[PDB]
Amino acid sequence: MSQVYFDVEADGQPIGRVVFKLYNDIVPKTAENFRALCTGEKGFGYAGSPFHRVIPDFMLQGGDFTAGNGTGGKSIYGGKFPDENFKKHHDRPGLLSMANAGPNTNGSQFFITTVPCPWLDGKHVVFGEVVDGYDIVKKVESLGSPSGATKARIVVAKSGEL
Amino acid sequence: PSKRVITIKTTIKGIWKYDYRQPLYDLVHTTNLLVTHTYAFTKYIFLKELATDENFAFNELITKDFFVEVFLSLVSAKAGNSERLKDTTKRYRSLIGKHKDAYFEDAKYTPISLAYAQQIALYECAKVQTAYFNNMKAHFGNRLRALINKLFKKKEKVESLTKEMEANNFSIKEIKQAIRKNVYQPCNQVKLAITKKNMPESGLLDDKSVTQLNEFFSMYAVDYTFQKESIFYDVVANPEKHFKAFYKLAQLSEAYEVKPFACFPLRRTFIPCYMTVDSKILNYHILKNKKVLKMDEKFNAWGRVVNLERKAFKSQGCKKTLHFQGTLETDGVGVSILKQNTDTNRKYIEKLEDAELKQTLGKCVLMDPGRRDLLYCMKETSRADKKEIMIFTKNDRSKCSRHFRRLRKLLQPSQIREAETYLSGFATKSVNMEKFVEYIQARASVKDILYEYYGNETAKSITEFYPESQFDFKVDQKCNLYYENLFVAKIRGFYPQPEHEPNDITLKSHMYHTYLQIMLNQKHISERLNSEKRRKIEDLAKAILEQPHESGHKTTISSLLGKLRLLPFRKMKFSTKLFSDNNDRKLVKNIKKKFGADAVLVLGNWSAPNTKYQDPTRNKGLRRMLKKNGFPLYLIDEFRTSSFCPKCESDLEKFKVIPNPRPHNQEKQPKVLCHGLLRCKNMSCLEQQTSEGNQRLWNRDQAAVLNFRKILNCLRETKQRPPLFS
DNA sequence: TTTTTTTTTTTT
DNA sequence: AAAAAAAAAAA
RNA sequence: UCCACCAAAGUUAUCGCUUUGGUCAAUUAAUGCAGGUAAGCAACAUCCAGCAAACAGA
DNA sequence: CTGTTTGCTGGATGTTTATCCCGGGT
DNA sequence: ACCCGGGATAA
Ligand SMILES: [Mg+2]
Ligand SMILES: [Zn+2]
C-alpha cells in the first residue's frame, strides 16, 4: 500500500498538505492509475488541477486537469476503464473514491468523503484513505458552499508519492 | 485528353482566414439575393411580354447573354461607354428597362452597389440557362402527352362508356375491348396527328379543342417542320424553338384545372445557396484588390486567404493528375474545392454465362430490398442452427435527418410559422400574371424576417424571436448538459450527490451559475457570442451571486442568449451529407465483416418507386454505392418469391392482427393485419405434434431470401428458372 | 416496331 | 388503391 | 408525428410484438474512412419531377 | 384535393481569362 | 506626357 501527498494552495497561498494511503493490494488498477496521475509519469497529472466542487459536510472533489470544471478527465488506460471491485464501503470519513457518470465511466476525477455515505455503496469505487492532514481537509471544507462553488480558487500545486 | 472533375468538401471555419470572413458572408448574401431577384425578374418580364402580345419573339431570349443583362440591371455601378455596347445588348437593356421600375416597386427592391459583378453574373446565368433547358427537355413531352389526353377527355369518355355499359350487363373483357377500340385508338390517332403537327381527323375533337390546338401550333413558325416527324424528338434535338410553345402548353394545363408545374425555373429557398468563387472574384470582392490579377499570381492570392498545404487543397487522384485551379463553391459555411486534370484556359443472374455464374459458389449474398427494412441479407451457408442474417433498416440512415427535422419543428419561431402560413396563399409555379405579382408582393412582405431567421449564421440579427421565454439548464441520464435543447458538454463527475431531492432554494438557484460558467467556456458557444454581449452576460452572472433569489437576472440572460436557439441550417446540411457518407461506409464495413471481403451481392429487382404515405427510398443510389465499393452486384427477379413457403412450396397468408404500427393513426384505425409475418396453410408443414394446430411462421424477408437461394440453386443446376417461379 | 395488358412487391 | 418491372397479346 | 446497433428467450429461421444481457460522440462539434511523424483513398453546385414533416385552405 | 418552408431521392448540365476604351486625376 | 479605375466584349 503506497502513499501519496498533495500540496494545497488557495489564491496562491499554501494552506496545508494531505497524505493519502492507497489500497494497492485490493484495487490494483485504480490505485495504479491514481499513482500515475499523481506522479505525472504519463506526461499529465493533477498538478494545477483545481477543486471544482466542495460540498460542506458532504465531500470534496477534484481531478479535472483538462477543463477544470468537471467536464474533463482522462485515465492512463484511455478515455475510461471499467469498475474493478467494491471490496470497500463508505462506512467512515476520510475515504478517497472515484467519481463517475455511471457504470464503467471511471476517469481521473476523484473525491474525498468527510462523513459516512452508506448510500454511495455499490455506485463508486473506494481506493484510498486519508492518513494525515484531515485537519487541512476540514479547513478546505469550511470554505465550501452547498452548491459546490468554492469561495476561493483551491488548486493542487505539487504532488508526490512515498 | 479526357477531363475529370473531383470535388472535396470542407468548412469555412477550417481553411478560411478570420481576417477575410465577413466579406465572404456579404458577397454570398448579395449574390444569393441578386440571383433570386434575377429569376423573379426574368419570369416577370417573360409573363408581361407574353401576356400582352403573342407575337413576341420569346424563343431567342432564352440565353445567357440576356440573363447577364437582367442580373446586371439589379446592380448599381458607374456607367460605361454606351456607344460600344453590342446590338443585342441594347435591345436586352431596353426590354429590361421597360419593366425595371415596375418590378422594383412590386418587389420593394433597391439596387445593391457591387463593383466587378460581371463574372458572378456569367456564372449564375449559365446555371439559369442550364435549369431552363433541362426542365424543358425533361418535362415538355410528358406535359404534352397529359394535355393531349385531357383534350380528348380520355377519363371522362372512359367513365361514361363504362357506366353506360354497366346498365347493359356487359362482361369485363367486352367492356375493356369496347374502351380500347372506342377511346384508346382514336386517342392514339390524335396523338400521332399532334406529333406530326397535322390536325387530327375531323370529329375526333370538339371545337374548343380544335381552337386550343390551333393556338398551340400558332406558336411555331408556319413553315417550321418538326425533325424526323416527331415533336417529342424535335424538342430534344432543337429545344431553342420550343420554349414559347412550352409556355402555351402550360397555360392550357391551367385552363383545365390541372396541377400547375414550374414552367419558368425560380429560386425560392431563403437559405443562402452556394456561389462560385473565382480568382477574379476573390481578388476584387474578398481581397479588396483594385488591380488586374493575372494567372502568374493566381495561386499567390489564394495563399493570402486560405492555406493550400492542407489535405483539402493537395493534389489528388491517380498519379496526382488532378489539381486545384483556383475555383471554389461556397455559401459561407460549406466549401467545395474542385480539382481537374486539364488547364482551365479557354446484369441479371438468369442472364449470366456459366463461367461467370459458377465462380460465385459460396460467396452469394441474397438481399431483399424493403421499405422499412432497407436490406435483409442472407448468405448461402445460412442454416436454422447458424443464422448468418443481416438487417439494415431505415432508422439507422434516418437518425440524423429525423433529429434535425425534430429540432427545426420544435425551435421554429412563431413569427416564421405565421410568415410561412401567410405566404402559403400564393402559388409560385402558376404562369398567370396576377398570381405571380401577388406572390412577389407576399414574398417582399416577409423576406426581411425569413432571411434574418435563415441567415442567422452570418447575417446581422437583431429581432427577438423568443419573447417571454425562460431557459433553464437540464442534465439527462447520461450526465450531458443541455440548455433547453443545445448540447453543452458531458459532465463526468455529476452522479456523486447528497441524499435524494435536495430541494433547498440556494442549491437550485446557484447551480444555474455553475452551469452558465461551464457553458460560456465552450468554444462552440463563445464563438457565437461577441465581446459586447459576453461582457454584459458576465456582468449579470456576477450579480446573480449576490441575489440568487431574484428572477430578473435569469430573464435578462435568457433574452441575451436567445441567439443560441437559432439553428445552423447550412451546417446541418453539411452534417447530413457527412452522416450519409458515414452510413454508407458503415454498411460496407458491416457487409465485409458479417459475410466476407469478396462477397457477391444478389439484390431484388424491386424498383422502389416513390409511393404516397411513405418516405423516399434509396434504390439506384444504393446500387451505385455498392458497385463503387467493388461489390459484384447482380439483380434477381422477385416473381412469386414471397407468396410461397420455402419448406414445402405451399402458399402463405397474413393472419396476425396488430395495432396500427404508426402511433398517430391508432386513434383512427386501431388495428391492421400484420404485413411482415406470414404462416403456411399446410398443417403438416410443421414438425410432428399432437394435433395442436400449430403452423410454421415466417418473416416475409426470410422467405424471400430462401426462395432467392432456391432460384439460384436451380439456375446453377439447370440454368433455367424454377417452374414455380416462372 | 409500338401500345396495352397480366402478375407480383411494398404498404398503406 | 398506386408506382415500375418482365414478359405476352394486339396491330 | 415517434423508433441507434449486437445476441438469448416466449418461438417454429415469430411480427414497427414483448422480457432480458451488452455497446453510447452526447453533439446547434468538424471535410469522412483507414493508418502513427509524412505517406492513401472519397464528385460537387443549380434547377426540375415525385415523396416526407409543420401549418393553412376545400 | 391544393398551397408555403425545409429535406430525401433521381435526372440533367457545368465547374475562366485577357483586352479595349472613356472618364478622372492632374 | 503619365497614371488610375471599371464596365464591357470575347474565345
Ligand atoms: Mg421482396
Ligand atoms: Zn410449408
CSV table of N, CA and C in Angstrom, one decimal, chain B residues 38-147:
chain,number,residue,atom,x,y,z
B,38,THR,N,-33.0,37.9,-59.9
B,38,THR,CA,-32.8,37.7,-61.4
B,38,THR,C,-33.9,36.7,-61.9
B,39,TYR,N,-34.0,35.6,-61.2
B,39,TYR,CA,-35.1,34.6,-61.6
B,39,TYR,C,-36.4,35.3,-61.6
B,40,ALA,N,-36.8,36.0,-60.5
B,40,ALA,CA,-38.1,36.6,-60.4
B,40,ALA,C,-38.3,37.6,-61.5
B,41,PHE,N,-37.3,38.4,-61.8
B,41,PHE,CA,-37.5,39.5,-62.8
B,41,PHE,C,-37.5,38.9,-64.2
B,42,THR,N,-36.8,37.9,-64.4
B,42,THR,CA,-36.8,37.2,-65.7
B,42,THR,C,-38.2,36.6,-66.0
B,43,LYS,N,-38.8,35.9,-65.0
B,43,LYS,CA,-40.1,35.4,-65.2
B,43,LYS,C,-41.1,36.5,-65.3
B,44,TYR,N,-41.0,37.6,-64.5
B,44,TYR,CA,-41.9,38.8,-64.6
B,44,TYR,C,-41.9,39.4,-66.0
B,45,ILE,N,-40.7,39.6,-66.6
B,45,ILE,CA,-40.6,40.1,-67.9
B,45,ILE,C,-41.2,39.2,-69.0
B,46,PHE,N,-40.9,37.9,-68.9
B,46,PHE,CA,-41.5,36.9,-69.8
B,46,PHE,C,-43.0,36.9,-69.8
B,47,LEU,N,-43.6,36.9,-68.5
B,47,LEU,CA,-45.0,36.9,-68.4
B,47,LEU,C,-45.6,38.2,-68.9
B,48,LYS,N,-45.0,39.3,-68.6
B,48,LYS,CA,-45.5,40.6,-69.0
B,48,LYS,C,-45.6,40.7,-70.5
B,49,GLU,N,-44.5,40.3,-71.2
B,49,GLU,CA,-44.4,40.3,-72.7
B,49,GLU,C,-45.4,39.4,-73.3
B,50,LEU,N,-45.4,38.1,-72.8
B,50,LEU,CA,-46.3,37.1,-73.4
B,50,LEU,C,-47.8,37.4,-73.0
B,51,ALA,N,-48.1,38.1,-72.0
B,51,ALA,CA,-49.5,38.4,-71.6
B,51,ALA,C,-50.1,39.6,-72.3
B,52,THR,N,-49.3,40.3,-73.1
B,52,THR,CA,-49.8,41.4,-73.9
B,52,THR,C,-49.8,41.2,-75.4
B,53,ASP,N,-48.8,40.5,-75.9
B,53,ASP,CA,-48.8,40.2,-77.4
B,53,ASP,C,-48.2,38.8,-77.5
B,54,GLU,N,-48.8,38.0,-78.3
B,54,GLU,CA,-48.4,36.6,-78.5
B,54,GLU,C,-47.3,36.5,-79.7
B,55,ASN,N,-47.1,37.6,-80.4
B,55,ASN,CA,-46.1,37.7,-81.4
B,55,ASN,C,-44.7,38.0,-80.9
B,56,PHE,N,-44.5,38.2,-79.6
B,56,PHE,CA,-43.2,38.5,-79.0
B,56,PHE,C,-42.3,37.3,-79.3
B,57,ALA,N,-41.0,37.7,-79.7
B,57,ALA,CA,-40.0,36.7,-80.0
B,57,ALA,C,-39.4,36.3,-78.7
B,58,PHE,N,-40.0,35.3,-78.0
B,58,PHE,CA,-39.6,34.9,-76.7
B,58,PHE,C,-38.6,33.7,-76.8
B,59,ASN,N,-38.6,33.0,-77.9
B,59,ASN,CA,-37.7,31.8,-78.1
B,59,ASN,C,-36.2,32.3,-78.0
B,60,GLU,N,-35.9,33.3,-78.7
B,60,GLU,CA,-34.5,33.7,-78.9
B,60,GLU,C,-33.9,34.4,-77.7
B,61,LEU,N,-34.8,34.8,-76.7
B,61,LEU,CA,-34.3,35.5,-75.5
B,61,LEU,C,-33.8,34.5,-74.4
B,62,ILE,N,-34.0,33.2,-74.6
B,62,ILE,CA,-33.5,32.3,-73.5
B,62,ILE,C,-32.0,32.0,-73.8
B,63,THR,N,-31.2,32.9,-73.3
B,63,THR,CA,-29.7,32.7,-73.5
B,63,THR,C,-29.1,33.4,-72.4
B,64,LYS,N,-27.8,33.1,-72.1
B,64,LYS,CA,-27.0,33.7,-71.0
B,64,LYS,C,-26.8,35.2,-71.3
B,65,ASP,N,-26.7,35.6,-72.6
B,65,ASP,CA,-26.5,37.0,-72.9
B,65,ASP,C,-27.5,37.9,-72.4
B,66,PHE,N,-28.8,37.4,-72.3
B,66,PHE,CA,-29.9,38.2,-71.8
B,66,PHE,C,-30.0,38.1,-70.3
B,67,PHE,N,-29.8,36.9,-69.7
B,67,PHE,CA,-29.8,36.7,-68.3
B,67,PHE,C,-28.7,37.6,-67.6
B,68,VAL,N,-27.5,37.8,-68.3
B,68,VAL,CA,-26.5,38.6,-67.7
B,68,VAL,C,-26.9,40.0,-67.6
B,69,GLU,N,-27.6,40.5,-68.6
B,69,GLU,CA,-28.1,41.9,-68.5
B,69,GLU,C,-29.2,42.0,-67.5
B,70,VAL,N,-30.0,41.0,-67.4
B,70,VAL,CA,-31.0,41.0,-66.3
B,70,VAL,C,-30.4,41.1,-64.9
B,71,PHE,N,-29.4,40.3,-64.7
B,71,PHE,CA,-28.7,40.3,-63.4
B,71,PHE,C,-28.0,41.6,-63.2
B,72,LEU,N,-27.4,42.2,-64.2
B,72,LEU,CA,-26.7,43.5,-64.0
B,72,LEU,C,-27.6,44.6,-63.8
B,73,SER,N,-28.8,44.5,-64.3
B,73,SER,CA,-29.8,45.6,-64.1
B,73,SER,C,-30.2,45.8,-62.6
B,74,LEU,N,-29.9,44.7,-61.8
B,74,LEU,CA,-30.2,44.8,-60.4
B,74,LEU,C,-29.0,45.3,-59.6
B,75,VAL,N,-27.9,45.7,-60.2
B,75,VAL,CA,-26.7,46.2,-59.6
B,75,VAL,C,-26.4,47.6,-60.1
B,76,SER,N,-26.1,48.5,-59.2
B,76,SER,CA,-25.8,49.9,-59.5
B,76,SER,C,-24.2,50.0,-59.6
B,77,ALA,N,-23.8,50.6,-60.7
B,77,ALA,CA,-22.4,50.8,-61.0
B,77,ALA,C,-22.2,51.9,-61.9
B,78,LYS,N,-21.0,52.5,-62.0
B,78,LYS,CA,-20.7,53.6,-62.9
B,78,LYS,C,-21.0,53.2,-64.3
B,79,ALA,N,-21.6,54.1,-65.1
B,79,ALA,CA,-21.9,53.8,-66.5
B,79,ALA,C,-20.7,53.9,-67.3
B,80,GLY,N,-20.7,53.0,-68.3
B,80,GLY,CA,-19.6,53.0,-69.3
B,80,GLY,C,-19.9,53.6,-70.6
B,81,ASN,N,-19.1,53.3,-71.6
B,81,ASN,CA,-19.3,53.8,-73.0
B,81,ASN,C,-20.5,53.1,-73.6
B,82,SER,N,-21.6,53.8,-73.8
B,82,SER,CA,-22.8,53.2,-74.3
B,82,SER,C,-22.7,53.0,-75.8
B,83,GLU,N,-21.9,53.8,-76.6
B,83,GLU,CA,-21.8,53.6,-78.0
B,83,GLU,C,-21.0,52.3,-78.4
B,84,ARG,N,-20.3,51.7,-77.4
B,84,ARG,CA,-19.6,50.5,-77.6
B,84,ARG,C,-20.4,49.2,-77.3
B,85,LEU,N,-21.6,49.4,-76.8
B,85,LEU,CA,-22.4,48.3,-76.5
B,85,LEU,C,-22.8,47.5,-77.7
B,86,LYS,N,-23.0,46.1,-77.6
B,86,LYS,CA,-23.4,45.3,-78.7
B,86,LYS,C,-24.8,45.5,-79.0
B,87,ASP,N,-25.2,45.2,-80.3
B,87,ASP,CA,-26.5,45.5,-80.8
B,87,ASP,C,-27.6,44.7,-79.9
B,88,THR,N,-27.3,43.4,-79.7
B,88,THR,CA,-28.3,42.6,-78.9
B,88,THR,C,-28.3,43.2,-77.4
B,89,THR,N,-27.2,43.6,-76.9
B,89,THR,CA,-27.2,44.2,-75.6
B,89,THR,C,-28.1,45.4,-75.4
B,90,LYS,N,-28.1,46.2,-76.4
B,90,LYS,CA,-29.0,47.4,-76.4
B,90,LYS,C,-30.5,47.0,-76.3
B,91,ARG,N,-30.9,46.0,-77.1
B,91,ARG,CA,-32.3,45.5,-77.1
B,91,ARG,C,-32.6,44.9,-75.8
B,92,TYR,N,-31.7,44.1,-75.2
B,92,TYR,CA,-31.9,43.5,-73.9
B,92,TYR,C,-32.1,44.5,-72.8
B,93,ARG,N,-31.2,45.5,-72.8
B,93,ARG,CA,-31.3,46.6,-71.8
B,93,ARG,C,-32.6,47.4,-72.0
B,94,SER,N,-33.0,47.7,-73.2
B,94,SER,CA,-34.2,48.4,-73.4
B,94,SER,C,-35.4,47.6,-72.8
B,95,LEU,N,-35.4,46.3,-73.2
B,95,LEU,CA,-36.5,45.4,-72.7
B,95,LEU,C,-36.5,45.3,-71.2
B,96,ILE,N,-35.4,45.2,-70.6
B,96,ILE,CA,-35.3,45.2,-69.1
B,96,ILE,C,-35.8,46.5,-68.5
B,97,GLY,N,-35.3,47.6,-69.1
B,97,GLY,CA,-35.8,48.9,-68.5
B,97,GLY,C,-37.2,49.2,-68.7
B,98,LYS,N,-37.9,48.5,-69.7
B,98,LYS,CA,-39.3,48.7,-69.9
B,98,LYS,C,-40.1,48.3,-68.6
B,99,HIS,N,-39.5,47.4,-67.8
B,99,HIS,CA,-40.2,46.9,-66.6
B,99,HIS,C,-39.4,47.0,-65.4
B,100,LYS,N,-38.2,47.6,-65.4
B,100,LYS,CA,-37.3,47.7,-64.2
B,100,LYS,C,-38.0,48.4,-63.1
B,101,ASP,N,-38.6,49.6,-63.4
B,101,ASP,CA,-39.2,50.4,-62.4
B,101,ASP,C,-40.4,49.8,-61.8
B,102,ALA,N,-41.2,49.1,-62.6
B,102,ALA,CA,-42.4,48.4,-62.1
B,102,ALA,C,-42.0,47.3,-61.2
B,103,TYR,N,-41.0,46.5,-61.7
B,103,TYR,CA,-40.6,45.3,-60.9
B,103,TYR,C,-40.0,45.8,-59.5
B,104,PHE,N,-39.2,46.9,-59.5
B,104,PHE,CA,-38.7,47.3,-58.3
B,104,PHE,C,-39.8,47.7,-57.3
B,105,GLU,N,-40.8,48.4,-57.7
B,105,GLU,CA,-41.9,48.7,-56.9
B,105,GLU,C,-42.7,47.5,-56.4
B,106,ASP,N,-42.9,46.5,-57.3
B,106,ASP,CA,-43.6,45.3,-57.0
B,106,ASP,C,-42.9,44.5,-55.9
B,107,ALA,N,-41.6,44.4,-56.0
B,107,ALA,CA,-40.8,43.6,-55.1
B,107,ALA,C,-40.2,44.4,-54.0
B,108,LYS,N,-40.4,45.8,-54.0
B,108,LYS,CA,-39.8,46.7,-53.0
B,108,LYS,C,-38.3,46.4,-52.8
B,109,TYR,N,-37.6,46.6,-53.9
B,109,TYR,CA,-36.2,46.3,-54.0
B,109,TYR,C,-35.4,47.6,-54.5
B,110,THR,N,-34.2,47.7,-54.1
B,110,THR,CA,-33.3,48.8,-54.5
B,110,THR,C,-32.0,48.2,-55.0
B,111,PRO,N,-31.4,48.8,-56.0
B,111,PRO,CA,-30.1,48.2,-56.5
B,111,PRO,C,-29.1,48.2,-55.4
B,112,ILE,N,-28.2,47.2,-55.4
B,112,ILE,CA,-27.2,47.0,-54.4
B,112,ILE,C,-25.8,47.3,-55.1
B,113,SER,N,-25.1,48.2,-54.5
B,113,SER,CA,-23.8,48.5,-55.1
B,113,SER,C,-22.8,47.3,-55.1
B,114,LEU,N,-22.4,46.9,-56.2
B,114,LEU,CA,-21.5,45.7,-56.3
B,114,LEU,C,-20.6,45.9,-57.5
B,115,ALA,N,-19.4,46.4,-57.3
B,115,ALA,CA,-18.5,46.6,-58.4
B,115,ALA,C,-17.9,45.2,-58.8
B,116,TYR,N,-17.5,45.1,-60.1
B,116,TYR,CA,-16.9,43.9,-60.6
B,116,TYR,C,-17.9,42.7,-60.5
B,117,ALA,N,-19.1,42.9,-61.0
B,117,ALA,CA,-20.1,41.9,-60.9
B,117,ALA,C,-20.3,41.1,-62.2
B,118,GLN,N,-19.4,41.3,-63.2
B,118,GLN,CA,-19.6,40.6,-64.5
B,118,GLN,C,-19.4,39.1,-64.3
B,119,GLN,N,-18.4,38.6,-63.6
B,119,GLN,CA,-18.1,37.2,-63.5
B,119,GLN,C,-19.2,36.5,-62.8
B,120,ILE,N,-19.7,37.1,-61.7
B,120,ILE,CA,-20.8,36.5,-60.9
B,120,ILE,C,-22.0,36.3,-61.8
B,121,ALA,N,-22.3,37.4,-62.6
B,121,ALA,CA,-23.4,37.3,-63.5
B,121,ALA,C,-23.3,36.2,-64.5
B,122,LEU,N,-22.1,36.1,-65.1
B,122,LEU,CA,-21.9,35.0,-66.0
B,122,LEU,C,-22.1,33.6,-65.4
B,123,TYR,N,-21.5,33.4,-64.2
B,123,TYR,CA,-21.6,32.1,-63.6
B,123,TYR,C,-23.0,31.7,-63.2
B,124,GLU,N,-23.8,32.7,-62.7
B,124,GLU,CA,-25.1,32.4,-62.3
B,124,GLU,C,-26.1,32.3,-63.5
B,125,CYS,N,-25.8,33.0,-64.5
B,125,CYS,CA,-26.7,33.0,-65.7
B,125,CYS,C,-26.4,31.7,-66.5
B,126,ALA,N,-25.2,31.1,-66.4
B,126,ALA,CA,-25.0,29.8,-67.0
B,126,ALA,C,-25.9,28.8,-66.4
B,127,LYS,N,-26.0,28.8,-65.0
B,127,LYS,CA,-26.8,27.9,-64.3
B,127,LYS,C,-28.3,28.1,-64.6
B,128,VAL,N,-28.7,29.4,-64.7
B,128,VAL,CA,-30.1,29.7,-65.1
B,128,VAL,C,-30.5,29.1,-66.4
B,129,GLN,N,-29.6,29.3,-67.4
B,129,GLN,CA,-29.9,28.7,-68.7
B,129,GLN,C,-29.9,27.2,-68.7
B,130,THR,N,-29.0,26.6,-67.9
B,130,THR,CA,-29.0,25.2,-67.8
B,130,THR,C,-30.3,24.7,-67.2
B,131,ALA,N,-30.8,25.3,-66.1
B,131,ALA,CA,-32.0,24.9,-65.5
B,131,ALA,C,-33.2,25.0,-66.5
B,132,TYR,N,-33.3,26.1,-67.2
B,132,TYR,CA,-34.4,26.3,-68.2
B,132,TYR,C,-34.3,25.1,-69.2
B,133,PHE,N,-33.2,24.9,-69.8
B,133,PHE,CA,-33.1,23.9,-70.8
B,133,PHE,C,-33.4,22.5,-70.3
B,134,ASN,N,-32.8,22.2,-69.1
B,134,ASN,CA,-33.0,20.9,-68.5
B,134,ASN,C,-34.5,20.6,-68.2
B,135,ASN,N,-35.2,21.6,-67.6
B,135,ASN,CA,-36.6,21.5,-67.3
B,135,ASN,C,-37.4,21.3,-68.5
B,136,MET,N,-37.2,22.0,-69.6
B,136,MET,CA,-38.0,21.9,-70.8
B,136,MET,C,-37.7,20.5,-71.4
B,137,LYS,N,-36.4,20.1,-71.6
B,137,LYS,CA,-36.1,18.8,-72.1
B,137,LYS,C,-36.8,17.7,-71.3
B,138,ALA,N,-36.8,17.8,-70.0
B,138,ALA,CA,-37.3,16.8,-69.2
B,138,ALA,C,-38.8,16.6,-69.3
B,139,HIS,N,-39.6,17.7,-69.2
B,139,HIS,CA,-41.0,17.6,-69.0
B,139,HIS,C,-41.9,18.1,-70.1
B,140,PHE,N,-41.3,18.6,-71.2
B,140,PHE,CA,-42.1,19.0,-72.3
B,140,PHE,C,-43.0,17.9,-72.9
B,141,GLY,N,-42.3,16.7,-73.1
B,141,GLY,CA,-43.1,15.6,-73.7
B,141,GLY,C,-44.1,15.1,-72.8
B,142,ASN,N,-43.8,14.9,-71.5
B,142,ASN,CA,-44.8,14.4,-70.6
B,142,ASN,C,-46.0,15.3,-70.4
B,143,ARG,N,-45.7,16.6,-70.3
B,143,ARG,CA,-46.8,17.6,-70.2
B,143,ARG,C,-47.6,17.7,-71.5
B,144,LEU,N,-47.0,17.5,-72.6
B,144,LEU,CA,-47.7,17.5,-73.9
B,144,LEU,C,-48.6,16.3,-74.0
B,145,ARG,N,-48.1,15.1,-73.5
B,145,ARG,CA,-49.0,13.9,-73.5
B,145,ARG,C,-50.2,14.1,-72.6
B,146,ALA,N,-49.9,14.7,-71.4
B,146,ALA,CA,-51.0,14.9,-70.5
B,146,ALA,C,-52.1,15.9,-71.1
B,147,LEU,N,-51.6,16.9,-71.8
B,147,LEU,CA,-52.6,17.8,-72.4
B,147,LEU,C,-53.3,17.1,-73.5
